[PDB]
Write an enzyme that holds these catalytic residues in place. Sequence first.
Site, short mmCIF file in Angstrom:
data_model
loop_
_atom_site.label_atom_id
_atom_site.label_comp_id
_atom_site.label_asym_id
_atom_site.label_seq_id
_atom_site.Cartn_x
_atom_site.Cartn_y
_atom_site.Cartn_z
N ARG A 77 0.78 -1.07 0.00
CA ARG A 77 -0.04 0.04 0.12
C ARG A 77 0.95 1.21 -0.01
O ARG A 77 0.49 2.13 -0.41
CB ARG A 77 -0.96 -0.07 1.25
CG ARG A 77 -0.31 0.51 2.47
CD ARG A 77 -1.13 0.44 3.65
NE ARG A 77 -1.99 -0.52 3.60
CZ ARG A 77 -3.36 -0.98 2.96
NH1 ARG A 77 -3.89 0.30 2.53
NH2 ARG A 77 -3.93 -2.02 3.36
N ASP B 267 -18.10 10.59 5.87
CA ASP B 267 -18.21 9.82 7.17
C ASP B 267 -19.21 10.45 8.07
O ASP B 267 -19.78 9.91 8.80
CB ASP B 267 -17.01 9.64 7.68
CG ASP B 267 -15.91 8.56 6.68
OD1 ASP B 267 -14.94 8.63 7.02
OD2 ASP B 267 -16.59 7.76 5.55
N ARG C 72 -22.56 10.22 6.71
CA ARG C 72 -23.08 8.95 6.95
C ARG C 72 -23.50 8.71 8.40
O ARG C 72 -24.33 8.33 8.73
CB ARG C 72 -21.92 8.05 6.63
CG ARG C 72 -21.74 7.85 4.99
CD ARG C 72 -20.61 6.74 4.81
NE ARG C 72 -20.74 6.36 3.38
CZ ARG C 72 -19.40 6.25 2.80
NH1 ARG C 72 -18.39 6.21 3.44
NH2 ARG C 72 -19.66 5.73 1.43
N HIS D 177 -8.93 10.21 8.19
CA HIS D 177 -9.96 9.64 7.61
C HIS D 177 -9.83 8.15 7.56
O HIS D 177 -8.64 7.59 7.18
CB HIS D 177 -9.59 10.21 6.02
CG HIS D 177 -10.75 9.36 4.97
ND1 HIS D 177 -12.00 9.42 4.92
CD2 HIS D 177 -10.60 8.40 3.93
CE1 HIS D 177 -12.60 8.86 4.01
NE2 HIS D 177 -11.64 8.17 3.43
O1 LIG Z 1 -13.58 6.89 -8.80
C1 LIG Z 1 -12.21 6.74 -9.40
O2 LIG Z 1 -12.05 7.73 -10.29
C2 LIG Z 1 -11.22 6.25 -8.06
O3 LIG Z 1 -11.55 6.06 -6.92
C3 LIG Z 1 -11.62 7.04 -5.94
C4 LIG Z 1 -10.92 8.57 -6.15
C5 LIG Z 1 -11.39 9.77 -5.32
F1 LIG Z 1 -11.02 10.62 -5.61
C6 LIG Z 1 -12.22 9.28 -4.36
C7 LIG Z 1 -12.66 7.91 -3.85
C8 LIG Z 1 -13.43 7.63 -2.72
C9 LIG Z 1 -13.34 8.46 -1.71
C10 LIG Z 1 -14.38 8.07 -0.33
C11 LIG Z 1 -14.94 6.67 -0.53
C12 LIG Z 1 -16.00 6.50 0.32
O4 LIG Z 1 -15.86 7.05 1.64
O5 LIG Z 1 -17.16 5.75 0.14
C13 LIG Z 1 -15.00 5.90 -1.84
N1 LIG Z 1 -14.28 6.29 -2.61
C14 LIG Z 1 -12.26 6.79 -4.73
#
Ligand SMILES: O=C(O)COc1cc(F)cc(-c2ccc(C(=O)O)cn2)c1
Lengths: 324, 324, 331, 328
Positions: free
Chosen positions: C105, C165, C168, C192
């Site tokens: 990661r 969040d 949510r 976060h």
């Molecule tokens: O969609 C694309 O282009 C790549 O993935 C991404 C890009 C981004 F800029 C924010 C999140 C993101 C942020 C938060 C959450 C969550 O809290 O559900 C989920 N996804 C995901």
Amino acid sequence: AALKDQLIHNLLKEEHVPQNKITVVGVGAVGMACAISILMKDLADELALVDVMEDKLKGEMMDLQHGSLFLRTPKIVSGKDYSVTANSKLVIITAGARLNLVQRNVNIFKFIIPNVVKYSPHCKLLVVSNPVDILTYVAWKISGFPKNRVIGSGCNLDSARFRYLMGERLGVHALSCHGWILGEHGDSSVPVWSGMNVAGVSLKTLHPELGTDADKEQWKQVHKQVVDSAYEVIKLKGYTTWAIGLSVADLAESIMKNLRRVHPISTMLKGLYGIKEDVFLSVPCVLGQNGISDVVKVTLTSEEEAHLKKSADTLWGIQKELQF
Amino acid sequence: AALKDQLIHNLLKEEHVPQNKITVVGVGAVGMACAISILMKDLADELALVDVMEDKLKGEMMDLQHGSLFLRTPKIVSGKDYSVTANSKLVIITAGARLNLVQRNVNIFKFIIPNVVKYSPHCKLLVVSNPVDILTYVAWKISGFPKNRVIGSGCNLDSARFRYLMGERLGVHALSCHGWILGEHGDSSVPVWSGMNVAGVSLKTLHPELGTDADKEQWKQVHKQVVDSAYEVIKLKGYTTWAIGLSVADLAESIMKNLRRVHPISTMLKGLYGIKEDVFLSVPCVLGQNGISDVVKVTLTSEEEAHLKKSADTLWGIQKELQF
Amino acid sequence: AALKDQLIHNLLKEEHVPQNKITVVGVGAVGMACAISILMKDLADELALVDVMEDKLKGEMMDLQHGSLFLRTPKIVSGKDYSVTANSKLVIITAGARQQEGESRLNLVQRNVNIFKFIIPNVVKYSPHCKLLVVSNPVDILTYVAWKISGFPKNRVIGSGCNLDSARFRYLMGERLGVHALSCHGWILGEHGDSSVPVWSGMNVAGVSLKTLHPELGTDADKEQWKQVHKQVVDSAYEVIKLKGYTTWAIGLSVADLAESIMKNLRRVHPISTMLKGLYGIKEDVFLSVPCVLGQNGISDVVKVTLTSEEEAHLKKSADTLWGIQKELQF
Amino acid sequence: AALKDQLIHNLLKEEHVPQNKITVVGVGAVGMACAISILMKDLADELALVDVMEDKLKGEMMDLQHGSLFLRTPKIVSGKDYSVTANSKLVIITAGARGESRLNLVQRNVNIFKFIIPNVVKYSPHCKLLVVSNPVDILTYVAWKISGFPKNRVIGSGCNLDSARFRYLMGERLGVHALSCHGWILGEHGDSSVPVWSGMNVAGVSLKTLHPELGTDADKEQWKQVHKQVVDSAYEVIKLKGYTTWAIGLSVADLAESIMKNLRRVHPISTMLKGLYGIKEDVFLSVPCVLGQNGISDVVKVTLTSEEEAHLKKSADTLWGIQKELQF
Ligand SMILES: O=C(O)COc1cc(F)cc(-c2ccc(C(=O)O)cn2)c1
Ligand SMILES: COc1cc(OC[C@@H](O)CO)c(Cl)cc1NC(=O)CSc1ccc(C(=O)O)cn1
Ligand SMILES: COc1cc(OC[C@@H](O)CO)c(Cl)cc1NC(=O)CSc1ccc(C(=O)O)cn1
Ligand SMILES: COc1cc(OC[C@@H](O)CO)c(Cl)cc1NC(=O)CSc1ccc(C(=O)O)cn1
Ligand SMILES: COc1cc(OC[C@@H](O)CO)c(Cl)cc1NC(=O)CSc1ccc(C(=O)O)cn1
Ligand SMILES: O=C(O)COc1cc(F)cc(-c2ccc(C(=O)O)cn2)c1
Ligand SMILES: O=C(O)COc1cc(F)cc(-c2ccc(C(=O)O)cn2)c1
Ligand SMILES: O=C(O)COc1cc(F)cc(-c2ccc(C(=O)O)cn2)c1
């Protein structure tokens, strides 16, 4: 064939049963402020205006109709006869008289309310007329309605003013400043100091003198200025309109869209907050398609509690006189 | 005492029934864009999602819910069982699956539509699944509904596309450019050149060769470019969503607010425009709380009429081959 | 004489400068959810999209354009070249690498740093004065990175952090209490994700403290187990990814709400990620969500939430961890 | 020590510049209506009101400010000094005075603009001007002359509300919403305005081609009367409520939306049209105009009959004849 038939072929025998209709009673400064706020917020598919001033009433109707191109509310109607208000979901009462009065406003509600319930048996009632907690009680008794369906605008506007005024001192938007004015609407209303916060940060805990005489920042004067601000604006332009009208439309919104938001508005609260009389006081109420369905039990100090009870006995004493 | 019961006193023990419910059947790319568009336009007080992909259905639901704070539609539900769609005012079909690719779409409707009408007997049906004119005929047959209450999106998007491209040539917003594509959705749709205008100025009059092969300015290619755009966008991003979504939401707004606006959508037009078959074609339609109640009778050229007549017969030709 | 000139008489030679232009970098699920939400709240008079996937980019652009009749945002543009984003008030970054099998990661973050090293300087070059809003995960870290690379003052570089969040949390909160999320109040702060802090002492309805009414609120011994509500918040992205493979609609609405506070200089308080080295007892150059007043100049003030000892301790630990990863990074 | 400082850490100093500021000049019935409409359509991040009646002014500002919780326009300011209007993108003028004569009335309005417009210009050099005060065609010309602004930036609401009134009445006769009914009133505001009968349609279906008598006195359905109704509906409402507000404020707000968002929608507004439509003098008449962030950028040239062009010419003569006799 007539030109309309040349252009347009009718395929359906059209039954006009209004679905999200709203009536404003009284086309005064307040009534029209509510009317236009509601029209601009797309809350109704139909709006009715009732009054006894027929030319005034016809004008306001025409003037509104003329902006149809710009609105999303396809039908606007007016009349001195209450058949025009038939099948309303919500009817907002701004009607009032121009010594001690209330019995005449009672007399006015004696004609208006039964006319209203007659044409909209299932509607919610929102009373804005002053004195709002009394007239709301009056409308409630005359209507025969259960209490959830009869609302007073109560301390809604004053809470909005208080949050605005809070935001000016703190330098952030009223949306992010939380504070509640409860109880009897007007001079004896309660600034619930313990509830004022930004982002869940209690101000009273940060600054224990908040709202007291020793308060170096004189926050008690913030409540004072809200209790005056109405009078002060009347002194300046003659009445108030825009702010009250906007605060009422906010209430229509929660009603029409069954939002179940909480607002400081006047509800019949016998059985709660130590109250034993049939009176209407402003408490945080859950507002939805069934009127007020729930009420938040706020934790009050012991004098805040005695203050609420005093308002109940005040309003009742005044109610005990009046006749219906 | 549960914390909820410490906080809130329940003053009313009430029941359900949603007043402005909308359902979207199918939570693929199009159905969801319809939902988010509907949710952001505040057209409903409840949204149901239904599909047979149970995980996808539940995921899309919860995702929408997590956005409540930012929406004014308090209730969002979903499920494979159609009870979740009970009492909808409007039900938007986007479900779909050689050229028994229709028959399989027919068999899908055979299941979904009776389910839809069971739980919402009085709903308007809005069919978006392609091929849309045929599929709207099919839900009409299966539902049993009167024709005014069964609507196909037909040429509504393609007209907006037309008007966008028009405003590109002319340098004004689409809102101000007027033009209609009617009849059979797809390649055989009719660009009604004579109706095109800005501010009531006939383009075809200023410019008689408009739309012809001789047209030096080639406006015919504009209509060709509308008819291809879905294929071009699919070619680039895999499918279209946003524009069709915005288009369906605008239809939903006419229905939910009874605007009686005129839209190019597919209606059962037997007895009009020279057509004698049970078929759906896009003509300019008056759309309100009762669906399509009126039709504008457009003055077509003999060439335009025979073209609509041909669409009627090829549609009826396809429909005859279906098993119900 | 062309039909346009026959119909339309031109009076002004137009040199078009956008006044409320917003750029969204990334036309994936999240980027387009941002785009459509922003389009439908009428927050910008010009919207621009950039990505590296050119067909996808053009497809989304044309799709939005074909919806022009139903919108009030008159110009929509896209391209791989960042000249299309010139003169933006707001630029929203959703670009990121998706993991492999495979790679740790840390190396996934680095690849993202490699993405931002190309993107942010292009952004800054064409909209020198814009505000930056970073949405990409891990958001606190990638927002710090965008901060460092851009050379913008901190007020102008914002992380979406715990904004979604908290929304949510409020929703789950209104489901338990039978009240709309709008009337429910509660804040998730700090880092976060898993290490976020549900600030129990601020939760309330109508300004009534849940904690005061229910002293077990958010403890291990709490019989109603409100802590689990936090866990629901922390897991809800995952749960949604299991169901539909990603999230969009929610994150998109919550970004657009941030956009609205910026474009309209509202100075509302949002739970968003900012450089808070020197505040909240933090000694390191890290971004953490606290309540920030948000306006046309970005983040102008932050509210100083009274935290418990343990909560200060969770933040400072989250601060150590972020600074630690931030050191391992190649800029 | 202070509570604000206790609650809030300040990180940024004030460089406060409005980005989308609108100023409404005059807080009478029309001004306020424009103001609340603009406030409810979220077109501005700052609103400014100006007038000479200082009490009424402060009162109106205050009422609007108490509704802030329900609005998304964070700053509303006011005062007799035009410094509060500075850096307006849009400035809407509704100011004016009420046997006097057309001419003496006009001259006093001209005298008000001689004080107002230069103050507007000193403080918002780059603003668009939008006049609403009557007679608008004339007072938009006075505004243009005095301001020294390029014509693209001085706009008179002209026949915009009347075109809208016309589509409303159309809609009532036809059984469809005004949005789906199209018709254009052009020329000089008021009774000399021309209802362009050949543009009226629904769904691109020309009503005049269906109903060739449309407009004329040979008409059994007296469609000519709808325009009279429009022309008259203003004073019919004044007769009934004393004035009008809601409709004109909504119409102005729609114009402001096109400007603030640079929509380039076409509206029937009054613009300096010397050279077009056959007009020789320096005169403002309503024609379809494309309206955006730089004001009026293009004009649609409608095809007019010979009589319709004669009307516009005669209006232009009457207008100029009046302006020719004014004291600037
Ligand atoms: O969609 C694309 O282009 C790549 O993935 C991404 C890009 C981004 F800029 C924010 C999140 C993101 C942020 C938060 C959450 C969550 O809290 O559900 C989920 N996804 C995901
Ligand atoms: C003075 O009585 C009224 C005032 C109203 O509102 C005034 C203003 O707020 C809006 O124009 C409205 Cl809507 C209606 C009425 N009147 C009535 O229904 C008929 S019954 C009635 C009863 C007692 C009285 C009285 O004592 O003056 C007058 N009218
Ligand atoms: C493939 O069958 C379906 C597609 C749908 O939408 C697809 C997509 O647009 C949204 O995800 C939706 Cl909502 C429902 C269904 N299916 C059904 O109800 C049951 S009935 C049925 C009949 C024939 C078939 C078939 O031949 O594939 C499948 N299902
Ligand atoms: C793969 O790298 C990218 C992903 C993006 O978003 C994808 C998704 O979130 C939205 O569609 C966007 Cl906008 C842009 C880029 N790429 C770039 O600028 C060029 S620089 C760069 C640096 C490292 C890498 C890598 O390690 O894969 C790729 N590209
Ligand atoms: C009567 O003069 C005015 C009317 C206004 O609006 C009235 C109404 O539309 C809203 O209340 C507004 Cl904003 C401003 C002014 N006046 C001025 O700037 C100062 S200059 C001036 C010059 C001659 C006159 C006059 O003829 O009495 C009045 N004022
Ligand atoms: O409008 C009319 O026709 C009669 O006057 C009314 C009627 C009404 F229904 C509420 C108020 C009212 C209520 C509250 C405040 C204030 O708090 O500023 C001011 N006015 C005034
Ligand atoms: O998205 C799904 O779940 C299945 O596919 C559908 C369903 C539907 F109901 C309409 C369209 C549709 C209709 C028109 C156009 C186009 O004109 O761009 C594109 N797509 C596509
Ligand atoms: O309201 C004030 O402050 C002074 O009076 C004004 C000012 C103004 F700027 C436009 C109108 C106006 C213009 C047109 C119509 C009508 O067509 O209904 C009605 N009123 C009236």
